[PDB]
């Protein structure tokens, strides 16, 4: 289809600091990709982001009932929804499954790449480390980054560029809020 | 901060498409199906603890529909610029022969939120067992999308995620095959 498209977006945002101690509420309006007016609980009124949203800022700021609704959103909307979903969102904990397998950087005879597959964890914050016989190797570590599977689980590959020796023991260490002690998986040649 | 909940909505002309969803730290809590007027929880366990009245969402899309007409006039009918997507194909877990797995097609950084996605195995459209997500919001206000295909790893099967978008001249094919 060649016909031009026209897109409108609205985003009601709730930003939480230390639980529900400090809460920030944003009411943002977008034409295509461009925000043109927003309400911010730090201000208490609508403010035009671009000249396109100035009529809506003055029009909405003249409606005190509307403004009183937006000023109460941190209590009736943000803290409320946080309380409804905190059991399966804020407190969701899934520990990862850790798999180690060798690979090749280039078509070589021997393997020169140790992959540490860390799959299915939540939340996303995680720290993965490589050790060669109990000594951490910070050189030659390449990662795929934090991959979002889109189903409330994350995954990441952390690869070590190394030439394995006989009797060498590598171990991949994983730290995650779902764990109380570091998860380790070892690999030897 | 430490947690962000976003109620994201959009309306699109002339497609007359509307969406309403909740985002938590980048994951979808639920969305409302406009046709059935139902709350759809991303994980079915979510519906056992929380509920949502789906008509409040349609009332918002009705206002977003009216605001879009106002903003289109205000911008002198300035249309949107197509931003083509980045496409990545990957598996849910490390691949083992004849051990079940899931193919994930990640479509990212694109607008408008219209896309045609096709899973191909050996160059043929596959429909069995596929699933997808609604259009998910980005902080740069583009969109992201997920498509899934459970499969059994075999050395004789190759796959492709074919993505069409008005910002693309040719359909984007992202390949996957077993080592």
């Amino acid at each position: 289809d060649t016909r031009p498209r026209f897109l409108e977006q609205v985003k009601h945002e709730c930003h939480f600091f230390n639980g529900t101690e400090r809460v920030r509420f944003l009411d943002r309006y977008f034409y295509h990709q461009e925000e043109y007016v927003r309400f911010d609980s730090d201000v208490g009124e609508y403010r035009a982001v671009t000249e396109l949203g100035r009529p809506d800022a003055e029009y909405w700021n003249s409606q005190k009932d509307l403004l009183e609704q937006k000023r109460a959103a941190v209590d009736t909307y943000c803290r409320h929804n946080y309380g409804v979903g905190e059991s399966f969102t804020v407190q969701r904990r899934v520990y990862p499954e850790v798999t180690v397998y060798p690979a090749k950087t280039q078509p070589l005879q021997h393997h020169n790449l140790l992959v540490c597959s860390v799959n299915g964890f939540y939340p996303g914050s995680i720290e993965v480390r490589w050790f060669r016989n109990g000594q951490e190797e910070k050189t030659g570590v390449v990662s795929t980054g934090l991959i979002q599977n889109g189903d409330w689980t994350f995954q990441t590959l952390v690869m070590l560029e190394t030439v394995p020796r006989s009797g060498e023991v590598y171990t991949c260490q994983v730290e995650h809020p779902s764990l109380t002690s570091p998860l380790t998986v070892e690999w030897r040649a | 901060e430490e947690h962000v909940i976003i109620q994201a909505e959009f309306y699109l002309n002339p497609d007359q498409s509307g969406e309403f969803m909740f985002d938590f730290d980048g994951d979808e809590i639920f969305h409302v199906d406009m046709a059935k007027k139902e709350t759809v929880w991303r994980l079915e366990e979510f519906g056992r603890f929380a509920s949502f009245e789906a008509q409040g969402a349609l009332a918002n899309i009705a206002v977003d529909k009216a605001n879009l007409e106002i903003m289109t006039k205000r911008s002198n009918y300035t249309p949107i610029t197509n931003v083509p997507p980045e496409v990545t194909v990957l598996t849910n877990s490390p691949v083992e022969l004849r051990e079940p797995n899931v193919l994930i097609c990640f479509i990212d950084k694109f607008t408008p939120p219209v896309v045609n996605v096709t899973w191909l195995r050996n160059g043929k459209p596959v429909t069995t067992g596929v699933s997808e997500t609604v259009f998910l919001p980005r902080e740069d206000h583009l969109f992201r999308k997920f498509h899934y295909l459970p499969f059994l790893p075999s050395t004789e099967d190759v796959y492709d995620c074919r993505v069409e978008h008005w910002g693309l001249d040719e359909p984007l094919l992202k390949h996957w095959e077993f080592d």
Binding site: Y29, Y77 | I29, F49, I70
Partner: peptide, 13 residues
């Protein structure tokens, strides 16, 4: 245990 939606503000005109 219902999640509250926030109202969209109707623009001018």
């Amino acid at each position: 245990q219902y999640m509250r939606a926030d109202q969209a503000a109707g623009g001018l005109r």
